[PDB]
Amino acid sequence: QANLMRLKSDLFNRSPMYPGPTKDDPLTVTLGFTLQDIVKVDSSTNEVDLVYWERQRWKLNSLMWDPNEYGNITDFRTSAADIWTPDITAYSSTRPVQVLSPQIAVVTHDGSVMFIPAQRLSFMCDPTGVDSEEGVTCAVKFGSWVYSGFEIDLKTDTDQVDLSSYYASSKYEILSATQTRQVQHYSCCPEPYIDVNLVVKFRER
Amino acid sequence: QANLMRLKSDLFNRSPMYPGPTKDDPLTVTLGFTLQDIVKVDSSTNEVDLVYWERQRWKLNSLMWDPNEYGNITDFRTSAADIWTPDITAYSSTRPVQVLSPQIAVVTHDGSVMFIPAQRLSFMCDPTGVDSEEGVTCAVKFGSWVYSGFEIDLKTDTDQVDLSSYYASSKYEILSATQTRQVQHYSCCPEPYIDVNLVVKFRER
Amino acid sequence: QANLMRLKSDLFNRSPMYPGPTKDDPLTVTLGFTLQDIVKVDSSTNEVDLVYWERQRWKLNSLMWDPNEYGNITDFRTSAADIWTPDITAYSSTRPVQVLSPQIAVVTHDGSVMFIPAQRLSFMCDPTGVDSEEGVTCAVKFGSWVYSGFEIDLKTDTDQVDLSSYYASSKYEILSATQTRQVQHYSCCPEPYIDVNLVVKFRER
Amino acid sequence: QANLMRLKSDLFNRSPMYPGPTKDDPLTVTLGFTLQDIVKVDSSTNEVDLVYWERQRWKLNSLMWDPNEYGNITDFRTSAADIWTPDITAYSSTRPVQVLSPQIAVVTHDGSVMFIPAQRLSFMCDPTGVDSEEGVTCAVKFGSWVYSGFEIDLKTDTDQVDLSSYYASSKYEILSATQTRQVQHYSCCPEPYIDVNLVVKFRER
Amino acid sequence: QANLMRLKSDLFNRSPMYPGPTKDDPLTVTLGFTLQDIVKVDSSTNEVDLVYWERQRWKLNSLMWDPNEYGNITDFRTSAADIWTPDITAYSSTRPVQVLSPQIAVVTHDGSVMFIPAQRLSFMCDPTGVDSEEGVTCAVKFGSWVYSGFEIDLKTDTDQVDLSSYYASSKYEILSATQTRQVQHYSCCPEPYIDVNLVVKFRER
């Protein structure tokens, strides 16, 4: 708490805050999902609720420091409201996402930030076939809402969704879960937008 | 990050916020709807729920700059709470509108602002006949709540609601989707009032 | 915009906020209701849901200005948070009232304020007989919570509830809707309180 | 209004907020309840919902003033957020309480404060026998959450619950309703613990 | 109350905010659960709702003080927002935890802090067999969300969950309730994490 108080002051109070990436200084955000449980399936309205962890990672020069000047501190924890965060969001949610975890990020001396919110999400899915052997497939896109591919690019560290914390006695079993970076060119806008596509095939019991 | 900080502070920290339009200095807000899905139909209460993107566009002289002065930044993204926004509301909602996307807008050097919140709206519609071949038509009007057409004029770039992102496997099919500007030279108050009427015709299957 | 910025700064940033009325300087608030729809009837809990606009009007000398001193501005819109508002509330709600419109008010140069929040309200009503030819009668009264008649008085411009914007395809037809000034005395307190009684008789179909 | 603003400035700005009661300077909170309706009874979850008013009264020397020094002002109204309030909490709630009235308090020149929030409360109650003629009895205790009897004392003005505003067409019929101060000493601690027990016997029709 | 104001001002305002523990200056959080009721069991979504109090205890050296310098004050109550708090969270919640008690803590002159918030938690649990004589078992982990064992270790003053406040007329009786410290090693990280595993076996009637 000696040099850690002095470090956080030198980063947040003295210096201004990141106003977000630009075309001249773009940013790459790494995205990884941890599927925990499929909680609800509404066939009357086509809604499916997921509980998942959202791994987000990015790096800013204006967060870097030299450990030898701050008690050999390599990393720290702080409120996610102390730093800038990307506007990563689902394209087809039907309700406001609810947050299940503390909003705290980890900041490392290279300027890399690690932020992993646990969330609950209702989204659009016709769940017809979930009670069959073949199951049913759903998909929901995640990406920046207002920044283009020239300002925020996405990447994944793997095409496989982490299922190592999927709830055992879940009403549903996961057949396949894949997260896949796409580059989307919409008819509305001259700039492309980049998303990671969370695709899940699943079935009952 | 260097020129953008200076730009954001010159625009926001060096002038009081735009107090809004007046009779002498009216404003034109362009409006457009993207129907993503019809999410709920209640024939017992006559409530229908929509998920849509509401595109709002306007231009302010006080938000103009010369890029040459700012490292040739032509546009930037900022929190919607940094800038003035129009009081566009649905005239027949039954529940508070729920925001599904980040509250971020796009400001351009010409002074223009693009703001597209994704939203869930519950409004008044008798869905009787939805299970017929002919379907049922709902309608909901959007406009400024407190500004007359003398301060805020409305406008659409097209009469057709954007259906390019409509849920491929939706519970309902859209038969027609129109967005129409309407002007009341009388609405219980001696003053011209303007709305954009959203008319949606749809049926089950 | 230059003059309006100045008027608002002069009103809101150079004088302490109005501390509300007192016995020595009372206030009269005008109240009117516009019934848009009866959205829910629950005979198992005796709750009825209304959607209405509540019109509130009052005058403060501390909001007066001479137009000549400010570009001939005669009136402007501002956030309701910028001004004092009366604590008018429904007496028999069963759930927190929900606001459906922007919290913005019109201020006029003579010091008059017009504030019209659209709302959804759940209140105590036994709807027994609503499917009868005669119908059922519900009532909810609205008043200040902590200001007596010596500090806040209420009046109405008409005794008839505005039904000109009632949903044409509502589940319920309105047989009569009145709004009446009433003096209430409580056992706890000597001072009388003033409210406005909203009486609505309606039926199905 | 000049004297009021001056008085408010003197109480809330020329001084720090009351840090709360201590063992050297204890405080007595008078508690009284007003039952308005019993709105929900869930026999499967053992939850009952009340709509009631919680009357709290205490007196601070720091809130005293001589009316002669302030143009004869003997009392005023002000947002509950401007002053300290006791942590009177229900001990067996199942859900967060929902506020139904404005949060304004009345402050009298003797330093006394009167604060009466209207609330919807969900609490633990096996309602078995509510349809019988003997009905059912439910109870919920109210007191400080973190202050012992050494810091906050509780007191009632009467043992009868105010039924003068009980909903006339309520689904239920109140057989008895009492509010009783209770003290429980413990062998580990010299500090007593104080609560007011709200006991309601009721039945259908 | 004069001494208390000066104490709180010396500890909070004339001192930098505690930045949380590190590898160098780690922290031990003592954890305890008082179970009040099992309020909901959903067998179609595998969700169980608990209401409980969560006793948190820890000690900062930065919150120590000499009572002799501040009028023999041994402890005081203050908002949980005035001080740093551990990010203890449930690992398998399905909805945001709902706080039922005031967010106030107690700080002792030795620097120790006791924080006991009442809560409603929804978590993943297959309730299959609850209506049987053997009953059913649920488990939920609680621990820091961003800190490892190096920064935060957990402790329990006992291994039995307090059932002395369990609702007597509950829909369910408890068969066993344990709170047991566990040390994990998730594959993502080379550092260990501490958690306390609340395990509850129970049944109807």
Ligand SMILES: CN1[C@@H]2CCC[C@H]1C[C@@H](NC(=O)c1nn(C)c3ccccc13)C2
């Ligand atoms: C990820 N985001 C980007 C692409 C679409 C969804 C969001 C919002 C944002 N959308 C848009 O900018 C957008 N959408 N429509 C239908 C338009 C029509 C005309 C002009 C702009 C737009 C950009």
Ligand SMILES: CN1[C@@H]2CCC[C@H]1C[C@@H](NC(=O)c1nn(C)c3ccccc13)C2
């Ligand atoms: C966009 N807005 C304008 C047009 C109607 C919808 C909203 C509400 C606003 N309403 C009104 O201003 C309004 N309404 N009633 C019944 C009144 C009676 C007397 C004076 C004013 C009003 C006007």
Ligand SMILES: CN1[C@@H]2CCC[C@H]1C[C@@H](NC(=O)c1nn(C)c3ccccc13)C2
């Ligand atoms: C409209 N108002 C609401 C809140 C305060 C003033 C009035 C009267 C009423 N509340 C009262 O103030 C009130 N009620 N009871 C039973 C009391 C007992 C002692 C002192 C005051 C009261 C409700």
Ligand SMILES: CN1[C@@H]2CCC[C@H]1C[C@@H](NC(=O)c1nn(C)c3ccccc13)C2
């Ligand atoms: C207001 N309070 C009451 C209700 C819950 C919150 C607080 C905590 C309080 N509990 C106590 O602090 C408590 N209880 N027992 C049996 C003890 C034995 C030794 C030391 C402390 C306690 C109970």
Ligand SMILES: CN1[C@@H]2CCC[C@H]1C[C@H](NC(=O)c1nn(C)c3ccccc13)C2
């Ligand atoms: C369960 N966890 C959460 C809460 C604390 C213990 C652990 C550790 C912590 N972080 C992680 O869970 C975590 N980190 N990375 C890089 C991951 C990659 C894939 C899956 C999970 C993670 C948060």
Ligand SMILES: *C1O[C@H](CO)[C@@H](O)[C@H](O)[C@H]1NC(C)=O
């Ligand atoms: C508390 O403070 C007083 C004042 O200085 C001190 O003299 C005394 O030791 C303490 N209390 C007792 C035991 O008198």
Ligand SMILES: *[C@@H]1O[C@H](CO)[C@@H](O)[C@H](O)[C@H]1NC(C)=O
């Ligand atoms: C755009 O502005 C930049 C400022 O660095 C300038 O270097 C550049 O010349 C400008 N564009 C043109 C016309 O080259």
Ligand SMILES: *[C@@H]1O[C@H](CO)[C@@H](O)[C@H](O)[C@H]1NC(C)=O
């Ligand atoms: C307002 O209007 C009057 C009359 O038209 C005009 O003479 C005066 O200059 C105006 N004041 C301002 C500042 O616009």
Ligand SMILES: *[C@@H]1O[C@H](CO)[C@@H](O)[C@H](O)[C@H]1NC(C)=O
């Ligand atoms: C209160 O002020 C008025 C004068 O404005 C006067 O009637 C009265 O004397 C004053 N109070 C007392 C106690 O005199």
Ligand code: NA
């Ligand atoms: Na009243």
